[PDB]
Amino acid sequence: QRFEGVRGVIITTTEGLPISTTIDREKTEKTAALVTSLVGKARSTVKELEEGELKFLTINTSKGEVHVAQEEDYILIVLK
């Protein structure tokens, strides 16, 4: 259950397996798979540019923003 303000939340493992979601199952699992690959390409981009560490990334869409952050064990996906 989400509070007032957020459009949606997905939490996945760093392997891409969703553990909790506010979105439908199929969309959650397919998004989780792509976001895990997205984070991997983002980390490699940070490394090649020698930008230090990946803090997070945000996807700007027609509906708003998709915030993506990866810790060691989980990836957080927040639609706002």
Next chain:
Amino acid sequence: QRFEGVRGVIITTTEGLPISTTIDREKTEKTAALVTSLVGKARSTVKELEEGELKFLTINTSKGEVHVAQEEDYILIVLK
């Protein structure tokens, strides 16, 4: 040549071939290859979430931000 304020700029084709850069050659080409894959995963993420269109994405790093936008023919990479 860049003006005051920006840390770096790379422009590539949608195939990942760089056309202009303020960064060294090898780093430019390897970044261009990864960013092209990054944009592709971002577009797929937007599609699966039904977020409409990908406007742009920003990578937050230890040094700042990496702005990435894709038009039909080119990808723009701005370090700020």
